[PDB]
DNA sequence: AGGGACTTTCCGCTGGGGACTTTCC
DNA sequence: TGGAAAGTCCCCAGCGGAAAGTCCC
């Protein structure tokens, strides 16, 4: 009965499975924000849980709560609470209740549905560390502890007064926001010059090169006044996290007799840009 | 008996009495949280501390100066609810100090003695930042923490006259910002007007890039094929001429005066202790 | 053409004159659109129709009694722009009437004849809801249509004194809701025995109005002129004695305990989440 | 202490469900 | 007119970003 307690997902001819695991990440929401929705599956759908081996005809109650991911044996995560998702499109009916300091949702597992359930009313609230730590008793730390597991459990009543209690966890779920863009960083370039017609393909080696990354060639005066800007073409295909394939643009002045020294940088999004790289254009 | 509300308005001068702020504190002062230790006492631009003094005091008795953090907002002065003075003790802490709570305002009390001219140097006073989460929860305070990060150093003293009357002088410093600035932006060099020069150095070099702050420095290096930096000289920057995109630098002299072959060295720009640009290239020429 | 601008605030008396509303209109009168027939005339809850009168007129010249529909907001009186008086004619219509138009406002005018003691039963008036889209597409307006669906019957009779001056009384009626919508949802306070009490509260108040479900709730709030609802406290609403028409509220305790000057605050009934009465008035007294 | 690294709060955008309004019976 | 149904437009869950607050290294 108590939340934190060793339980297997299967006993005798009874087995509780996560037929459909949730996504790896799921930014949780604060009480001061709206809701950020329910935990979804990679497919775009939702997780699914099921109880195999049931003979009876009386529906059961599937219990849901946010637990820990760390090594230690499963226990309610003191910094997260399942958030009950209501209507709008929610299909599984759900009841909400507290258990100690843990909120717990409970949807029905009706046999008319092979004791299968589509968890799509489960969201993830995030308590404020300060609020919890300060609690007299808790000796845990919220700081940097932002992973969880959807814990599902069903209690199977036996016509023998006995009760078989099964429990099941989802794969770990990361619940913190993750920056949309990383800072690009060019460490090496297989080209440092080339004729003004450009054309050739240059390969950059660095970090955080997403497929959206872009490359810009510029040239400015000692003043700082930019007197030339040209975006360079990238070989999306070959492009990888650590390597970049670009097509050195044509320089602005076809006919030059002196080598021209220009600049270029990779950029992710509207801000995250690496730093000025050097290149040179040689006379025809 | 000297208990007059901190919300009570008092003035800097009364008759033959005036409490001026001799040495105002710095515009900014990073305040510390309780989870942190302390981050010093407030300091004056001098590099030392702020100074308070009571002028027009003929008597020869030891008075008690009071200190606390006030609100530097569009309303009337009053104790800031998210900030408290912080008592600093020990070593270089010259002036002595006494701490005490009033309402929810921690008040510091230093001594104002005649032997020193009813003058004092503030150096046992720091600014602790209370948590927005804690304060707002208090059944009462209707104020917000969100962006309220300006404070003021209020000083007040209760003078007891023979006439039985107790004059009360109060005075608040100028505004002090209590939120650490913005960490450093990565300097970026896109161009330089010089690529080499005689080992005697001494010439001025102009760099063109972004994120250069007068608080920027330029460092020259040189390593072996192994990467062993076998040299490291800091070049002088022309603080005046320099700007966001233009950094003026004085090429430092080379280590080995007499060489026969050209030496290829490097140099980088740096903001703060960390944020530094990537190595740039430069060459010193034999005499 | 002695029509004096409708915006000019005017007392309901000027000397021994007194323009009163003998009988008051119902709390509600669903108005009709120009795509519907007419939903009839305004009536008194007594069953009959609203009654107006003028006291202090010894003369014999039967005077006219203008009538237009006005706003029922916090602001000063002003001609409502999403409502027009509808001139109703017929058999049972005892009183005659003349319909004119002052600018974008349609005005009605019946006779206030002396041979009736300067009385007048208003059984010939209706209210026409205008489409919000059309009044909001007017070059010169700034008021919102949506939700703004409360109005008041406005009267004002011109009187010529033998001294050259033209007096002018005006006496609008209670507020009237014109939408079957809110008429059925929104709760309306119409009576409150207590206007004020001391800052601690406790004192129990009785409200008499309409649409008071067991789910009703009262809420005291206070806001700065800037509209900053700073305080909001829900008063315990006696679920017992309360009835479809009466509520017993335990006046909550005011937020500031040591207040000096009376603080005026607002309170309101509210069912569900949207269904809420109109801002009521109360004033807390210091101790 | 100087500088960041992780946690909260707060701003904006968008689509389909209501809240209201206006047309019908 | 009393009762709605059809029509319109506001509003907020859900998210994605990112600035302000806290507090480690």
Residue B54 CA to residue B12 CA, distance in Å, equals 10
Report the gap between the CA of B244 and the closest CA in chain A (Å).
Answer: 10
- For chain B residues 105-134, those near strand D by a CB cutoff of 7 A are 133
Taking the CB of residue A172, how many other CB atoms lie within 10 A of it? Answer: 15
Q: Which class is C179-287 in CATH?
A: mainly beta
Which residues from chain B sit within 8 angstroms of residue A261, using beta carbons?
Answer: 191
Distance between the alpha carbon (CA) of C73 and the C1' atom of E2, Å: 28
Burial A1-12 (b: 16+ CB within 10 A, else e): eebeeebebeee
Residue B67 CA to residue B152 CA, distance in Å, equals 10
Residue B104 CA to residue A34 CA, distance in Å, equals 33
Query: What sign for the dihedral angle of Cα B8, B13, B17, B21?
Result: positive
Contacts of B202 (CB under 8 A, 6+ apart): B250, B251, B253
Residue C184 CA to residue A244 CA, distance in Å, equals 67
Superfamily covering domain B6-178: Rel homology domain (RHD), DNA-binding domain (2.60.40.340)
Residue A224 CA to residue B188 CA, distance in Å, equals 12
SS3 B174: coil
Asked if strand D comes closer than 7 Å to A177 Cβ, the answer is yes
Q: Residues of CATH 2.60.40.10 domain(s) within chain A? A: 176-284
Which phi and psi (to 5°) does residue A236 adopt? -30, -55
Q: Which pair of tokens denotes residue C103?
A: 């600018």
SS3 C15: coil
CATH of domain B179-285: 2.60.40.10
Q: Do chains A and B touch (3 or more CB pairs under 8 A)?
A: yes
Quick one: how far is CA B183 from the chain centroid?
15
Beta bridge partners of A129: none
Is the CB of residue A60 less than 8 Å from the CB of residue A51?
A: yes
**How does DSSP classify residue B80?**
-
Beta bridge partners of C168: C158
| Closest nucleotide over all strands to C37 (CA to C1') | E1
Is the CB of residue B52 less than 8 Å from the CB of residue B22?
A: yes
Burial A19-51 (b: 16+ CB within 10 A, else e): ebebbeebebbeeeeeebbbbbbeeeebbbbbb
Residue B115 CA to residue B137 CA, distance in Å, equals 46
The closest alpha carbon to C110, from A115, C102, C119, A93, belongs to C119
CB contact under 8 A, A222 and B246: yes
Q: Residues of CATH 2.60.40.340 domain(s) within chain A? A: 3-175
CATH topology of domain A176-284: Immunoglobulin-like (2.60.40)
Asked if strand D comes closer than 7 Å to A275 Cβ, the answer is no
Nearest residue in chain A measured CA to CA from B244: A224
Query: Could you give the dihedral angle defined by the CA atoms of residues A231, A232, A238 and A239, in that order, rounded to the nearest 10 degrees?
Result: -40
Is the CB of residue B261 less than 8 Å from the CB of residue B251?
A: no
Residue A184 CA to residue B280 CA, distance in Å, equals 19
Q: Residues of CATH 2.60.40.340 domain(s) within chain C? A: 6-178
Residue B54's H or E segment, with its range, is strand B51-55
SS3 C114: helix
Positions of chain E reached by protein Cβ under 7 A:
1-4, 8-10, 12-18, 20-25
Residue C244 CA to residue C156 CA, distance in Å, equals 36
The closest alpha carbon to B109, from B128, B122, B118, B94, belongs to B122
Rounded to 5°, angle at Cα C14 from C13 and C16: 85
User: Of A128, A131, A222, which has the smallest distance from its Cβ to B191's Cβ?
Assistant: A222
Burial class (CB in 10 A: 0-12, 13-18, 19+), B259: middle
Residue C226 CA to residue B153 CA, distance in Å, equals 30
Is the CB of residue B174 less than 8 Å from the CB of residue B151?
A: no
Total residue count of chain A as it appears in this document? 284
Query: Could you give the dihedral angle defined by the CA atoms of residues C269, C273, C274 and C275, in that order, rounded to the nearest 10 degrees?
Result: -40
| CB-side neighbour CA atoms (13 Å) of A272 | 17
Q: Which pair of tokens denotes residue C141?
A: 């307006």
Q: Residues of CATH 2.60.40.10 domain(s) within chain B? A: 179-285
Is the CB of residue B107 less than 8 Å from the CB of residue B120?
A: no
Positions of chain D reached by protein Cβ under 7 A:
1-4, 6-12, 17-25
Is the CB of residue A138 less than 8 Å from the CB of residue A78?
A: yes
Quick one: how far is CA A3 from the chain centroid?
27
Q: Are strands B83-87 and B125-129 parallel, antiparallel or unpaired?
A: antiparallel
Residue B65 CA to residue B53 CA, distance in Å, equals 9
Nearest residue in chain B measured CA to CA from C228: B142
Interface of B with A (CB under 8 A): 131, 133-134, 186, 188-191, 193, 206, 208-209, 245-246, 277-278
Residue A151 CA to residue A39 CA, distance in Å, equals 13
CATH entry 1.10.1040.10 includes domain A3-175? no
Burial class (CB in 10 A: 0-12, 13-18, 19+), C149: buried
CB contact under 8 A, A222 and B208: yes
Q: Which pair of tokens denotes residue B234?
A: 């800091």
SS3 C132: helix
Q: Are strands A10-11 and A14-20 parallel, antiparallel or unpaired?
A: antiparallel
Which residues from chain B sit within 8 angstroms of residue A227, using beta carbons?
Answer: none
Beta bridge partners of B265: B282
Rounded to 5°, angle at Cα C163 from C160 and C164: 60
Nearest residue in chain B measured CA to CA from C231: B142
Query: Could you give the dihedral angle defined by the CA atoms of residues B103, B105, B106 and B111, in that order, rounded to the nearest 10 degrees?
Result: -90
SS3 C218: strand
**How does DSSP classify residue C169?**
E
| CB-side neighbour CA atoms (13 Å) of B99 | 11
Distance between the alpha carbon (CA) of A120 and the C1' atom of D16, Å: 19
Q: Residues of CATH 2.60.40.10 domain(s) within chain C? A: 179-287
Distance between the alpha carbon (CA) of C6 and the C1' atom of D20, Å: 30
SS3 C231: strand
Contacts of B189 (CB under 8 A, 6+ apart): A276, B207, B208, B209, B247, B269, B277, B280
Is the CB of residue A154 less than 8 Å from the CB of residue A63?
A: yes
Residue A256 CA to residue A217 CA, distance in Å, equals 18
Residue B252 CA to residue B273 CA, distance in Å, equals 21
The closest alpha carbon to A117, from A55, A167, A46, belongs to A46
Taking the CB of residue C210, how many other CB atoms lie within 10 A of it? Answer: 17
CA distances from A44 to A38, B142, B194 (A): 11, 44, 58
Is the CB of residue B250 less than 8 Å from the CB of residue B208?
A: no
Q: Which pair of tokens denotes residue C211?
A: 């649409």
Residue C51 CA to residue C67 CA, distance in Å, equals 12
Q: Are strands A193-195 and A277-282 parallel, antiparallel or unpaired?
A: parallel
CB contact under 8 A, A224 and B245: yes
Which phi and psi (to 5°) does residue C252 adopt? -60, 175
CB contact under 8 A, B188 and A130: no
Residue C198 CA to residue C219 CA, distance in Å, equals 17
Interface of A with B (CB under 8 A): 128, 130-131, 218, 220-224, 261, 263, 275-276
Asked if strand D comes closer than 7 Å to B180 Cβ, the answer is yes
Q: Which pair of tokens denotes residue B255?
A: 């280590």
The closest alpha carbon to A208, from A248, A243, A237, belongs to A243
Q: What is the 3-state secondary structure (H, E, C) of chain A?
A: CCCCCCCCCEECCEEEEEEECCCCECCCEECCCCCCCECCCCCCCCCEEEEECCCCCCCEEEEEEEECCCCCCCCECCCEEEEECCCCCCCCCCEEEEECCEEEEEEEECHHHCCEECCCCEEEEECCHHHHHCCCCCCCCCCCCCEEEEEEEEEEECCCCCEEEEEEECCCEECCCCCCCCCCEEEEECCCEEECCCCCEEEEEEECCCCCCEEEEEEECCCCCEEEEEEEEECCCCCCCCEEEEECCCCCCCCCCCCEEEEEEEECCCCCECCCEEEEEECC
Interface of C with B (CB under 8 A): 230-231, 255
């Amino acid at each position: 009965v108590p939340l934190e307690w060793p339980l297997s997902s299967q006993s005798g001819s009874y087995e509780l499975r996560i037929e459909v695991q949730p996504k790896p990440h799921h930014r949780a929401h604060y009480e001061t924000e709206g809701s950020r929705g329910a935990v979804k599956a990679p497919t775009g759908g939702h997780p699914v849980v099921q109880l195999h081996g049931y003979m009876e005809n009386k529906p059961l109650g599937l219990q849901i709560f946010i637990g820990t991911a760390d090594e230690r044996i499963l226990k309610p995560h003191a910094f997260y609470q399942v958030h009950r998702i209501t209507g709008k499109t929610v299909t599984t009916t759900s009841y909400e209740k507290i258990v100690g300091n843990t909120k717990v949702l409970e949807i029905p597992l009706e046999p008319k549905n092979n004791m299968r359930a589509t968890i799509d009313c489960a969201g993830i609230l995030k308590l404020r560390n300060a609020d919890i730590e300060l609690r007299k008793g808790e000796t845990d730390i919220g700081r940097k502890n932002t992973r969880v597991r959807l814990v599902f459990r069903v209690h199977i009543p036996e016509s023998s007064g006995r009760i078989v209690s099964l429990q099941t966890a989802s794969n770990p779920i990361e619940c913190s926001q993750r920056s949309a863009h990383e800072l690009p960083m060019v460490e090496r370039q297989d080209t440092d010059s080339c004729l003004v017609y450009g054309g050739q393909q240059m390969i950059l080696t660095g970090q955080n090169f997403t497929s959206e990354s872009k490359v810009v060639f510029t040239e400015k005066t000692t003043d700082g006044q930019q007197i030339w800007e040209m975006e360079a073409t990238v070989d999306k295909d070959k492009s990888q996290p650590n390597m970049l394939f670009v097509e050195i643009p044509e320089y602005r002045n076809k006919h030059i007799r002196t080598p021209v020294k220009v600049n270029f940088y990779v950029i992710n999004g509207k801000r995250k840009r690496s730093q000025p790289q050097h290149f040179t254009y040689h006379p025809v």
